[PDB]
Structures are given as structure tokens and as C-alpha cells.
Ligand binder design. Structure first.
Ligand SMILES: Cc1cc2nc3c(=O)[nH]c(=O)nc-3n(C[C@H](O)[C@H](O)[C@H](O)COP(=O)(O)O)c2cc1C
Ligand SMILES: Cc1cc2nc3c(=O)[nH]c(=O)nc-3n(C[C@H](O)[C@H](O)[C@H](O)COP(=O)(O)O)c2cc1C
Lengths: 210, 210
């Protein structure tokens, strides 16, 4: 790890929007940064995130057809963009995994039903909006970890959702009935000082119940 | 920070669900950890998160009325629970800050309207579902940072959404028309070894566009 200093990585994280157009990131490292991000938590461990990596001029051209122009600087200059979509059928993926173990004979049907019992009635019976809701949280927490991982690797990043929400999933070659678009994570070596920001005094946003 | 080892804080983070009942956390450190998490990014820097801290027995007993029974052990034993809710009127909050900036006479009127133009029409013009969407994302990324910040302070944590989504916001004494429940963050010193979990091979979840 280029930067294992947690305070520095987290408390000095800003949205960098201008990257060195000459720096590329190998696909080995990109997949690795994604895996590291994916140590993130998720409800019932469904890990309902999906990454589409945009790291070539050709990919960027297609991708930009669903991105609003004010986010083109990040997109044009970034070494890679990792777009994060939410899999609203992730509970079936999870189920399929366990079903296979059972079919192999390495768990009984009883064990399989016990496993499925812990998540499947909940998710199988959930509304589309709740599914969308849960997948969005998963996408966001892993997105947050990816922002941090990028800096841990010596890079910088910008999360963005300034996009065409109805166009993005088909633009990525994904199944629009299944995946919900959440955010893009542009990653690169910083070529320009990020815009400074402030935060509210957290006391204005905090209540003690008793 | 007690633990500034990023790899350790992030890659060894587990959901801890049973805490030492006798370890307490002072409200200054609780408020500090919240402030640290709140360095998190957010669309248009609206910071649409709201925190309700539950750190007394009285507060726990009321809070638990809106929590599902299988999450009782976490709430019962944690030093504190930070409940995170989404403020779907956060754009009016940011507006009010720039009005007071004018009300002090340190910006012109047209800068104020310029400043307002770059977020307030976008958010006023958005469906309640989209406001809910954006606020949830905000709650999730600050939630993720709080999980890490807790470990950076030498504690552990569990995020949970196993709640009564009708009762939570009124149980917290918040306006149900304004705030949306997203997740609770139980924080304390671990009293059990956490359940082991696995992750998918992240390559199964990753596409390269071109
Ligand atoms: C969900 C989300 C969406 C965002 N979308 C954009 C975007 O479309 N364009 C952009 O320039 N920045 C975007 N950002 C970055 C924010 O503007 C930035 O995080 C905020 O102003 C705080 O600044 P900082 O990240 O430098 O600390 C987004 C951030 C989040 C969390
Ligand atoms: C949005 C969200 C909601 C969660 N809700 C619960 C919950 O209600 N009860 C619980 O025990 N754990 C809950 N968790 C923790 C997950 O079960 C856990 O993160 C997942 O199984 C991976 O385990 P790990 O956190 O130890 O890596 C939740 C996690 C997330 C991200």
C-alpha cells in the first residue's frame, strides 16, 4: 500500500476532478482496488454491487453518452472510471451459490433450506423499491471504500451521479430490468488542486435521544 | 487515533454484534467520531445525513421499539447506537446558510442567487423518490466512514437496517415527512469473535466496457 495512513487517506480526501491524462492504471491493479473495496459490509452479505470499468478512449466515448457534460473533465482525464450499479436480483445470485453446494451433495437439503431461510423470504418478497433501496446502500458503502482505496494506492478520485439515469444501464450493456445506476468513481493521479469544501458543524446534525 | 493502520482498520473490519456492556463512550468522543465520519463526500456537498445518538438505557428501551428482535443483542450491549437518517429537505438547509451569508452582507444578492442556482433548482425539481435516493447515498457513505472511524478509535461496530421502517423516525422524535430511516450503527468494545464471512471473487461482479 502506497498510503496506509488512515487519517491522511480519509481526512484529506477531496473530490479530484482533473487527472493526469498520461497516467494509466493496469487492469490488475484496478481489479485489486475493487476487490479491496468489496471488503465492505452489505445487508445479509448479498454484496449487491456491480462494477463496470471504463478505461479506454473507446469506452469513455460510449460511456459519455449517458454522462452529463459538466462531468466530462473527470471522465476524459481519468485513468479509469469504475461505474457502480446495484444488482436488484443479488438475492438470487446468493441463492444460486448455495443451491449448487447442495446439488454437489456437500450440504443436505435441510441445511440449504436453513441457509435460504435467513435471507430469501425477506428479499424474495421485497418490493422493487426496497430492493432498489438496499442495493443503493451496498453500492454506496463500497463506493465510499473505493474512494479511500484509490488514495491508499497513491491515486485520487471523484464520485459522481450527474448522469442520465434512464440511459446509463443500457449504455453500459447491462440489463435495465435488473441493475440500478448509482454512481461513477473516476480514478487517477491528481493533476489539479481539488476545490476546497467545508462541512457543517456536526452538532447541528446530531441529536441525543436521551 | 488509536488505530491509524488503514489496511487493518478496513480489511479486518467485521460486524461485531456483542459488545462489552460495561464499556462506555463519552459524548465528546461520540460527537468527534461523527464529525470525522462526516468528512464523507455528498452530492452538491448537501451532507444530507442526520444522527440520533442512543447511549443511555432509557434511550435504548425507547429505540428498541422500532428495531427488529434479532438486532436486540447489538442494541442491548453496545456503548452507543448512532442512528443515521436522511434529510430530504437538506437543500433548504444549505440554502438557509447562504441566505445568512447575505443577511450578514458579505455577499451580494446576485452571488446568492448564483450560489443558489447551482443546486436549489435541481433539488426542488426532483421527485421525492430521488431526494430519498440521494439522501440514502449520503447516509450510506457517512455510515461506511463511521464504521471505519469507530475501529480507528479502538472500537468495533455493526451496521443494521433490520428495523421497523414505519416506527423508527417517529420513535426518534423526527418529522416523518422530512427524514427517512437508513441505518443504525451500534458501537462498542467487542465481547464476541464476529461471524466469519466470505466475499465473491470480485471478477464475477466486474465488467470491462471496452
Ligand atoms: C452521490 C454523490 C454524487 C456526486 N456527484 C458529483 C457530480 O455529479 N459531479 C461532481 O463534480 N461531483 C460529484 N460529487 C462530489 C461532491 O461534489 C463532493 O463530494 C462534495 O462537494 C464534497 O467535496 P469533497 O468530496 O471534495 O470533500 C458527488 C458526490 C456524491 C457522494
Ligand atoms: C445496510 C446494512 C444493513 C445491515 N443490517 C444488519 C442487520 O440488520 N443485522 C445484522 O446482524 N447485521 C446487519 N448488517 C451487517 C451484515 O450482515 C454484514 O456486513 C455482512 O454479513 C458482512 O459481514 P461483515 O460485516 O462482518 O463483513 C447490515 C449491513 C449493512 C451494510
Amino acid at each position: 500500500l502506497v498510503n496506509n495512513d488512515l487519517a491522511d487517506v480519509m481526512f484529506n480526501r477531496h473530490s479530484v476532478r482533473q487527472f493526469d491524462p498520461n497516467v494509466k492504471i493496469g487492469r490488475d491493479e484496478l481489479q485489486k482496488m475493487i476487490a479491496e473495496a468489496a471488503t465492505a459490509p452489505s445487508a445479509c452479505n448479498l454484496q449487491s454491487w456491480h462494477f463496470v470499468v471504463v478505461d479506454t478512449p473507446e469506452a469513455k466515448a460510449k460511456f459519455k453518452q449517458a454522462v452529463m457534460k459538466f462531468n466530462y473533465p473527470q471522465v476524459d482525464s481519468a485513468s479509469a472510471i469504475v461505474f457502480i450499479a446495484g444488482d436488484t436480483q443479488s438475492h438470487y445470485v446468493y441463492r444460486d451459490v448455495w443451491n449448487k453446494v447442495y446439488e454437489d451433495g456437500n450440504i443436505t437439503k435441510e441445511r440449504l433450506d436453513q441457509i435460504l431461510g435467513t435471507f430469501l423470504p425477506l428479499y424474495e418478497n421485497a418490493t422493487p423499491d426496497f430492493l432498489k433501496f438496499d442495493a443503493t446502500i451496498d453500492c454506496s458503502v463500497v463506493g465510499m471504500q473505493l474512494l479511500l482505496v484509490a488514495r491508499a494506492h497513491g491515486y485520487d478520485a471523484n464520485a459522481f451521479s450527474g448522469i442520465d439515469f434512464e440511459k446509463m444501464i443500457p449504455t453500459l450493456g447491462l440489463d435495465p430490468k435488473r441493475y440500478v445506476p448509482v454512481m461513477g468513481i473516476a480514478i487517477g493521479k491528481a493533476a489539479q488542486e481539488p476545490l476546497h469544501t467545508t462541512r457543517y458543524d456536526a452538532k447541528t446534525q446530531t441529536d441525543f435521544l436521551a
